[PDB]
Amino acid sequence: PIETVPVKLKPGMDGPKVKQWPLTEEKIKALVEICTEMEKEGKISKIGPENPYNTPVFAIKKKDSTKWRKLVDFRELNKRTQDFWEVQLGIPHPAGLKKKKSVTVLDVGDAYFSVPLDEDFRKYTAFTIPSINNETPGIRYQYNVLPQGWKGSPAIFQSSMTKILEPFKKQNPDIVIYQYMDDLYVGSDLEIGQHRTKIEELRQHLLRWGLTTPDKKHQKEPPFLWMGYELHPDKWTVQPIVLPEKDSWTVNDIQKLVGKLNWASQIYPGIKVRQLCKLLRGTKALTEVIPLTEEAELELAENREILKEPVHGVYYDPSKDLIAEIQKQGQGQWTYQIYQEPFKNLKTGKYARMRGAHTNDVKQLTEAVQKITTESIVIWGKTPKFKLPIQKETWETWWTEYWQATWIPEWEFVNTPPLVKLWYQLEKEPIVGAETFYVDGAGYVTNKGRQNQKTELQAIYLALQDSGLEVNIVTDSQYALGIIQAQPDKSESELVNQIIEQLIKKEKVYLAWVPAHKGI
Amino acid sequence: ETVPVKLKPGMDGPKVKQWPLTEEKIKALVEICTEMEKEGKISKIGPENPYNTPVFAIKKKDSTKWRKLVDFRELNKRTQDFWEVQLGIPHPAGLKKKKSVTVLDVGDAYFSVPLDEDFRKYTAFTIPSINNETPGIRYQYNVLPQGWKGSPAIFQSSMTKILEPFKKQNPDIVIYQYMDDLYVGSDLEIGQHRTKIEELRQHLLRWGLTTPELHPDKVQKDSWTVNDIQKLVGKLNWASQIYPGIKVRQLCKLLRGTKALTEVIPLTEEAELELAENREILKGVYYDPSKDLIAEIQKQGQGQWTYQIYQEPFKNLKTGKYARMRGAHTNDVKQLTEAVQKITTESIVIWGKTPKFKLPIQKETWETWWTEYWQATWIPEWEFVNTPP
Numbered sequence: 001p002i003e004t005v006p007v008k009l010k011p012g013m014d015g016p017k018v019k020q021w022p023l024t025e026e027k028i029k030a031l032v033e034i035c036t037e038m039e040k041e042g043k044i045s046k047i048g049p050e051n052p053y054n055t056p057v058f059a060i061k062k063k064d065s066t067k068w069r070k071l072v073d074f075r076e077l078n079k080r081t082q083d084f085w086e087v088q089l090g091i092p093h094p095a096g097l098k099k100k101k102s103v104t105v106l107d108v109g110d111a112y113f114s115v116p117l118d119e120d121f122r123k124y125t126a127f128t129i130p131s132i133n134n135e136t137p138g139i140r141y142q143y144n145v146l147p148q149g150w151k152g153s154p155a156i157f158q159s160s161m162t163k164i165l166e167p168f169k170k171q172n173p174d175i176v177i178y179q180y181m182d183d184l185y186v187g188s189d190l191e192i193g194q195h196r197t198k199i200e201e202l203r204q205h206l207l208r209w210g211l212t213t214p215d216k217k218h219q220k221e222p223p224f225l226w227m228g229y230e231l232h233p234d235k236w237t238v239q240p241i242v243l244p245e246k247d248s249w250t251v252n253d254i255q256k257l258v259g260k261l262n263w264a265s266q267i268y269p270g271i272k273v274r275q276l277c278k279l280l281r282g283t284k285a286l287t288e289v290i291p292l293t294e295e296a297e298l299e300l301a302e303n304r305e306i307l308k309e310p311v312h313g314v315y316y317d318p319s320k321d322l323i324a325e326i327q328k329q330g331q332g333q334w335t336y337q338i339y340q341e342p343f344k345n346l347k348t349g350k351y352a353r354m355r356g357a358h359t360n361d362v363k364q365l366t367e368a369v370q371k372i373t374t375e376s377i378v379i380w381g382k383t384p385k386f387k388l389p390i391q392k393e394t395w396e397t398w399w400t401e402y403w404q405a406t407w408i409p410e411w412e413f414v415n416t417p418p419l420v421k422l423w424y425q426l427e428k429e430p431i432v433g434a435e436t437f438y439v440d441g442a443g444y445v446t447n448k449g450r451q452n453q454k455t456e457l458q459a460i461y462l463a464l465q466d467s468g469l470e471v472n473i474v475t476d477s478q479y480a481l482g483i484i485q486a487q488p489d490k491s492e493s494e495l496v497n498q499i500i501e502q503l504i505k506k507e508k509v510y511l512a513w514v515p516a517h518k519g520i
Numbered sequence: 521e522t523v524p525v526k527l528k529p530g531m532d533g534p535k536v537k538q539w540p541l542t543e544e545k546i547k548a549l550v551e552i553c554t555e556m557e558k559e560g561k562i563s564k565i566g567p568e569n570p571y572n573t574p575v576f577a578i579k580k581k582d583s584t585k586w587r588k589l590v591d592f593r594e595l596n597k598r599t600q601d602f603w604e605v606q607l608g609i610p611h612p613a614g615l616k617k618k619k620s621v622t623v624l625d626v627g628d629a630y631f632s633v634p635l636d637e638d639f640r641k642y643t644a645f646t647i648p649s650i651n652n653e654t655p656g657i658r659y660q661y662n663v664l665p666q667g668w669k670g671s672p673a674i675f676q677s678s679m680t681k682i683l684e685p686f687k688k689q690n691p692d693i694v695i696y697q698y699m700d701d702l703y704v705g706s707d708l709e710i711g712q713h714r715t716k717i718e719e720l721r722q723h724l725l726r727w728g729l730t731t732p733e734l735h736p737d738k739v740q741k742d743s744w745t746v747n748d749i750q751k752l753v754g755k756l757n758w759a760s761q762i763y764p765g766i767k768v769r770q771l772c773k774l775l776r777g778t779k780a781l782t783e784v785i786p787l788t789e790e791a792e793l794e795l796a797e798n799r800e801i802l803k804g805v806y807y808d809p810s811k812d813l814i815a816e817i818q819k820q821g822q823g824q825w826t827y828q829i830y831q832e833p834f835k836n837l838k839t840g841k842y843a844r845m846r847g848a849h850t851n852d853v854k855q856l857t858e859a860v861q862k863i864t865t866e867s868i869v870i871w872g873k874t875p876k877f878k879l880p881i882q883k884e885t886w887e888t889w890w891t892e893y894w895q896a897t898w899i900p901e902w903e904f905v906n907t908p909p
């Protein structure tokens with residue numbers, strides 16, 4: 001017998017009350033048959049007319065087996081119920097699973113009909129099975145056991161299973177039991193001979209506490225197909241991914257394609273989806289057809305080529321240290337690889353650039369490092385030792401000049417194309433013997449005598465070409481001044497592209513701000 | 521006897537989510553919490569309690585033993601407005617003028633006093649699991665929480681009874697209790713202050729009060745190039761808002777027009793006198809008793825961090841500068857963390873409140889790296905969002 005959890009309605013809300021619309025004769029015959037069987041087993045107990053609460057029943061014949069089953073809509077009952085700690089919604093990532101000699105999948109059977117329910121709350125879960133016409137008011141039933149579809153069934157069953165499994169985990173500490181939904185995943189380092197005995201002992205424990213489990217013969221054998229992951233004995237791979245070859249492409253098709261490619265990126269290295277997501281920028285009808293641009297077609301060709309090869313990941317041995325490599329890609333794509341030993345990869349991924357944002361490659365690298373750090377914390381619990389393209393001196397220059405606070409875990413320098421380094425290379429002091437420049441948002445006034453926010457950007461660009469290699473400029477606008485300051489090597493905007501192209505060649509360019517002043 | 525604790529009218533308890541933590545922190549929290557439950561301070565809760573409050577493990581005074589900080593800010597926003605109005609804590613003003621002020625942690629006392637049965641449920645915390653292996657072990661605080669404002673309010677009667685003999689013996693000592701901290705301030709010399717603090721520690725320990733040093737006495741040749749005068753007039757326009765007597769119109773006339781950036785310009789006489797008058801002008805501290813103090817941290821680089829505490833903008837109540845102090849470790853996260861702690865302690869000794877912080881760092885970086893370098897029980901309300909300085 002399992003102790004019940006105290007559950008109550010939300011403060012100030014009465015029990016559900018809904019009326020049951022009439023149903024056909026075949027449906028009521030099936031419903032009374034199944035309900036009488038359940039009452040004989042004991043899940044539902046008939047209650048008299050004292051209870052005024054009703055929750056309607058809808059009879060459905062599932063296409064398989066041609067049998068009429070019962071589905072009760074508890075939506076109203078779910079609304080009129082105390083809040084419960086949401087069950088964890090993140091599936092265990094296969095990368096963090098430490099390899100064990102034998103692993104079994106024990107799927108508990110009819111669990112929500114085995115964990116019981118609180119006596120006070122049994123009253124509101126009353127459903128009516130109508131009689132033919134109005135000869136009798138009908139049959140009235142209540143639920144002694146946890147209903148299906150109720151808000152709190154997952155949390156209550158999870159707590160019940162945890163309490164039942166706790167003493168077994170205390171007695172046998174080597175066995176590791178993962179819980180996800182109803183199933184219990186059990187893994188022990190023991191040989192198969194003792195492991196079968198231990199799994200039988202777990203089954204008998206759950207049977208003495210009332211939870212049925214599958215038999216020894218019916219337990220699944222490797223490989224396992226779980227939430228899109230194929231878990232082999234010594235490798236984890238995503239399920240076979242078939243990219244659609246449809247010539248026509250709808251917004252829904254592109255959404256599915258991007259979702260599939262993002263799911264594939266976790267093991268497949270080099271999957272690029274940036275162009276497709278740019279195709280999906282704006283809202284459109286799912287029937288609306290967006291033609292594949294040339295850039296997106298190139299992206300889909302390279303992605304399909306990558307998906308042709310099979311790639312497999314490896315599980316986690318805690319002794320060795322995690323190592324993360326970030327490899328630069330075109331534009332703002334950043335492919336990151338996590339591997340404990342070389343050429344065997346635990347997980348691959350991508351960091352897409354901030355949509356509609358132009359930033360320095362070093363700042364994008366910093367964001368990528370932070371994303372890797374948080375993902376590694378969540379999955380494994382330790383931050384990796386990074387291996388980054390950027391040179392230490394470039395990082396130090398940007399770190400000291402930048403106004404925010406940026407830190408990166410222990411990292412080292414890997415030599416590979418491309419290498420991230422600063423391009424603007426601005427200085428902070430005026431140059432003697434160099435032309436001194438004034439800009440006003442496209443006119444230029446000069447010591448030599450030579451004579452809206454984007455306009456200042458245009459004006460500050462015009463300053464560079466005229467002056468030459470060594471320049472000293474002052475700008476009337478802090479916006480253009482900040483654009484040149486930010487050292488944006490992304491070159492997303494066209495005007496900024498022009499400015500960077502002209503700036504890279506120059507040997508020494510220093511720019512300062514002069515406020516507008518009363519008088520000449 | 522349990523005292524009635526009530527949330528503010530029409531406010532729901534905390535539901536905040538928990539931040540994933542490292543395996544070492546999870547193991548330390550698990551062992552600490554298991555021992556604490558065996559002692560009786562925390563007890564298990566099932567799924568019927570939805571409320572949650574984060575748990576962070578910090579290492580104190582670079583010692584081996586881990587400690588636990590429960591970020592009870594969301595619960596404090598609701599409960600303290602009930603308890604502080606109902607019970608309150610007076611603030612001594614002499615702590616500013618005291619030559620020496622010391623902080624003694626007092627958290628062990630709250631581990632003895634019980635708590636209201638109904639209010640227990642709103643103090644719930646979870647210890648996360650790596651890779652979603654198991655649902656987190658959830659707990660509730662049966663005994664008075666450590667780090668939740670209102671625990672000093674509930675324990676104030678006992679604290680007064682426990683400090684009355686010592687305060688009667690020593691009239692000059694000034695003692696003020698923010699949450700889990702006692703501020704002892706003496707005008708005596710520093711050695712005598714050490715002796716008095718030792719005497720206070722012995723007194724508290726003998727009365728069953730277990731406990732484990734900022735100095736308040738100690739606000740901040742060649743004619744210049746044309747662009748240098750431009751830099752000065754830029755600072756003029758910047759500081760026009762801060763002080764009204766500041767004036768620009770005479771240094772401006774020197775740089776008016778197009779000039780060479782390396783040109784050497786002698787000052788006009790009126791411009792030089794105007795520079796002197798501006799300096800004289802440079803050379804609204806009215807603290808609103810009820811306001812949200814906000815402190816802005818500005819990274820000047822080179823291991824220097826300037827802060828400004830102000831209630832309404834352009835009326836600074838205090839300005840200062842903090843310099844880097846560790847040559848072995850240079851990370852901006854740690855430097856910002858120590859800046860925040862020092863600013864908060866100075867604010868606590870000067871006025872009652874702990875400021876809201878506008879931090880320069882970015883959101884995820886702070887969220888990932890604050891717990892490693894935090895060394896204080898209190899947790900201020902920070903906005904990771906920064907403004908470009």
Ligand SMILES: N#Cc1ccc2c(Oc3ccccc3OCCn3ccc(=S)[nH]c3=O)cccc2c1
Nearest residue numbers: 097098099100103176185186187222224226231233
């Ligand atoms: N379908 C299904 C399914 C089956 C097992 C799962 C699982 O098993 C473990 C359970 C406990 C510890 C380690 C585990 O896995 C180690 C790694 N591992 C994985 C597979 C094999 S065959 N052998 C092996 O060593 C953990 C999480 C999800 C699971 C889903």
